[PDB]
Amino acid sequence: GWKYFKGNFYYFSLIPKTWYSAEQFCVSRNSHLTSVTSESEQEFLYKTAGGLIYWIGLTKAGMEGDWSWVDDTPFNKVQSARFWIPGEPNNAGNNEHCGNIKAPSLQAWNDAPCDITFLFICKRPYVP
Ligand SMILES: CO[C@H]1O[C@H](CO)[C@@H](O)[C@H](O)[C@H]1NC(C)=O
Numbered sequence: 001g002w003k004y005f006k007g008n009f010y011y012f013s014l015i016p017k018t019w020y021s022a023e024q025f026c027v028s029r030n031s032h033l034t035s036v037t038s039e040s041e042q043e044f045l046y047k048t049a050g051g052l053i054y055w056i057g058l059t060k061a062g063m064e065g066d067w068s069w070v071d072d073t074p075f076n077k078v079q080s081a082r083f084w085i086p087g088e089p090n091n092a093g094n095n096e097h098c099g100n101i102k103a104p105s106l107q108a109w110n111d112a113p114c115d116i117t118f119l120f121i122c123k124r125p126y127v128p
C-alpha cells in the first residue's frame with residue numbers, strides 16, 4: 001500500500017494510533033513518521049490525506065520546546081512557517097507537543113496532544 005513520491009515511499013495508515021505508537025509502527029516497517037521539506041511534498045501529503053487528520057513526524061525537542069522531525073531532518077523554522085494553519089502552533093492546554101496534517105491547504109499543520117489517536121503517515125527512503 002506504499003505510495004511513491006520523489007525518492008521516498010509513503011504509508012497512509014488505516015488504523016489510528018497515538019503519535020508514539022505510530023512512530024513505533026513506522027520504525028517496525030523500516031521507516032519514520034514523515035518529515036516535510038518542500039512545498040511539493042506538503043502538497044502531495046495533504047492532497048493524499050483527502051481531508052482526514054494524519055500524524056506526521058513533528059515533535060518537540062530541547063528545553064525551549066523547539067519543533068523537530070523524528071527522522072532527524074533538521075527543522076527549518078523559516079522555511080516551514082508557511083506550512084502551519086494560521087494560529088498554530090498554539091500549544092492548546094499547554095499540552096500539544098506533536099504535530100499532524102489537519103487542513104487541506106499548504107497551511108496544513110496543527111499541534112495536538114501526543115496521546116490522542118489519529119491515522120498516521122510513514123516515510124521510507126527508496127535506496128536503488
Ligand atoms: C479546539 O481545539 C482544536 O482546534 C484548535 C484551533 O482552533 C487547535 O489549535 C487545537 O490543537 C485543536 N485541538 C485538538 C485536540 O485537536
Ligand SMILES: [Ca+2]
Nearest residue numbers: 090091092111
Ligand atoms: Ca494546536
